[PDB]
Design a protein around this ligand. Structure first.
Ligand code: HEM
Ligand code: YTT
Ligand code: CYN
Length: 394
């Protein structure tokens, strides 16, 4: 006898398990056990993943309810699971979105300058270099300090909360609350700091004193800073890191993009499609009985939307494992989700990766792994799949 299939399948972000395609073909919605011991429905086909994400009766907010089956333990206050809903209800969605656009004046130039400086420092120190800790993550951290309007020198300490904040744990994490409370206190101080007049926090600081927003709590304003820093930095840094691995292992694509950088956006879009950076399915709690494929999901049950299930589905993306730059449906992947909770940072995340890759290909055209790929150490029990170090030479 065997136990119920357990999720997640593998923390490795450099290859998709063969089990995904078998599940998708045989049982594209099927019962699994999460790290907490709860049962859940794992959805792995494009059609069913999109169905769940487009039906608000599969609720993100309700995953935080006491007594619900859990994918993992909360690392934020339960109300923050509904963060974007709270932002929208406060009338702040448009202002937040405008602050985090990659098109802000001078932003793209700042990111290129930062990428080029990071790379120059690695070249000066000499191979091997660690492209995660000394390139992708610092680039993400610098980008988000600039977007938020906060001092660059405050970035590293905020970043160091993230190895705990984005854990995927069976049990509550005491360090997560320590860091959360401290980071909230930091953002609350930023809102009171007269030097902070630009970026997202500069705009929230002004809206906070605007009578049209007098209802909104200081709690929400500080929470926006902590959450957009954390989600943005973890996702952009982790995506760029694993995209760099995908690129390094494809020297002909690396060369094609180096020779024709105008194809970088189409390349990044395919790297997004094939990306394994999300370590768990996206969770939703059913608020009604809802038929999904062959399964009547029952009110109160947990559903997990496996992004690589959808994104490697051959019925939607023929030859799904291949990077094809001329697909008819190129942004139709689920790397940024779909529906009510579609990523508000999608444009910033695309541009971060495009600029990072453009800079790396110009400065390090001969970039290659400096260790055999199996030697990468994949972080476990975390909400992203990332190598602890990414050693390269050039
Ligand atoms: C390559 C980079 C990124 C990727 C792959 C990514 C991926 C995702 C995905 C898949 C979701 C949907 C979550 C769900 O439906 O449960 C999401 C939502 C979200 N993302 Fe990102 N994201 C990226 C960058 C960013 C950035 C740069 C920011 C902010 C600065 C950000 C902030 C958020 C927030 C706040 C949500 C919740 C939206 C809501 O609940 O309506 N993300 N992201
Ligand atoms: O739970 C949330 N928490 C924050 C994201 C977040 C999670 C942890 C943390 O320490 C900071 C931010 C949110 O904005 N909405 C929700 C949903 C979410 C989760 C992860 C993620 O990457 C994006 C969204
Ligand atoms: C987005 N995290």
């Amino acid at each position: 006898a065997t136990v119920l299939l357990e999720v997640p399948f593998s923390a490795r972000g450099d290859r998709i398990p063969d089990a995904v395609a078998e599940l998708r073909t045989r049982e594209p919605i099927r019962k699994v056990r999460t790290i907490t011991g709860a049962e859940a429905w794992l959805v792995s086909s494009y059609a069913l993943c999109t169905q769940v994400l487009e039906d608000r009766r599969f609720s993100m907010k309700e995953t935080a309810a006491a007594g619900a089956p859990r994918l993992n333990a909360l690392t934020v206050p339960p109300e923050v699971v509904n963060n974007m809903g709270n932002i929208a209800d406060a009338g702040l969605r448009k202002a937040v979105m405008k602050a985090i656009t990659p098109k802000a004046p001078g932003l793209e130039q700042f990111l290129r300058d930062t990428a080029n400086s990071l790379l120059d420092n690695l070249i000066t120190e000499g191979a091997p270099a660690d492209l995660r800790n000394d390139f992708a993550d610092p680039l993400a951290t610098a980008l988000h300090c600039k977007v938020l309007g906060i001092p660059q020198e405050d970035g590293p300490k905020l970043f160091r909360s993230l190895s705990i904040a984005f854990m995927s744990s069976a049990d509550p994490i005491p360090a997560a609350k320590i860091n959360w409370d401290r980071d909230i206190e930091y953002m609350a101080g930023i809102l009171e700091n007269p030097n902070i007049t630009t970026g997202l926090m500069g705009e929230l600081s002004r809206l906070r004193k605007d009578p049209a927003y007098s209802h909104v709590s200081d709690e929400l304003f500080a929470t926006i800073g902590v959450t957009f820093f954390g989600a943005g930095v973890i996702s952009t840094g982790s995506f760029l890191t694993t995209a760099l691995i995908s690129l390094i292992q494809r020297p002909q694509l690396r060369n094609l993009l180096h020779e024709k950088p105008e194809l970088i956006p189409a390349g990044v879009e395919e790297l997004l499609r094939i990306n394994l950076s999300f370590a768990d399915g996206l969770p939703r709690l059913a608020t009604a009985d809802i038929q999904v494929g062959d399964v009547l999901v029952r009110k109160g049950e947990l559903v997990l939307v496996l992004l690589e299930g959808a994104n490697f589905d051959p019925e939607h993306f023929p030859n799904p494992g291949s990077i094809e730059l001329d697909r008819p449906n190129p942004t139709s992947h689920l790397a940024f989700g779909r529906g009510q909770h579609f990523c508000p940072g999608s444009a910033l995340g695309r541009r971060h990766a495009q600029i990072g890759i453009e800079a790396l290909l110009k400065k390090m055209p001969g970039v290659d792994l400096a260790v055999p790929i199996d030697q990468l150490v994949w972080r476990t029990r975390f909400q992203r799949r990332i190598p602890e170090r990414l050693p390269v030479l050039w």
